[PDB]
């Protein structure tokens, strides 16, 4: 049945088109998450740095209070 094999082929082409779009979405998602990795790195580093300076700063205010008393 030529008509029947032709009809199935049309279904398979539709499948292929949909998979192509789906694969593009997965690819784009990966790229965006790779890009966002840069932000996460900097944020982690800055917040860690900030925490250590705050700890030092509090240490200074403690000693300052010790003297002022």
């Amino acid at each position: 049945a030529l008509a029947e094999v032709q009809a199935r082929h049309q279904e398979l082409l539709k499948l292929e088109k949909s998979m192509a779009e789906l694969t593009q979405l997965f690819n784009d998602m990966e790229e965006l998450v790779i890009e966002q990795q840069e932000n996460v790195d900097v944020i982690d580093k800055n917040v860690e740095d900030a925490q250590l300076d705050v700890e030092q700063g509090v240490g200074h205010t403690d000693k300052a209070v010790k003297s002022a008393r």
């Binding site: 800055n46 917040v47 900030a50 300076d53 705050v54 700063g57 200074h60």
Partner: peptide
């Protein structure tokens, strides 16, 4: 935040 934390450290010192 990092800048402000450093500024606070320095000011406290």
């Amino acid at each position: 935040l990092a800048v402000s934390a450093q500024g606070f450290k320095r000011g406290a010192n």
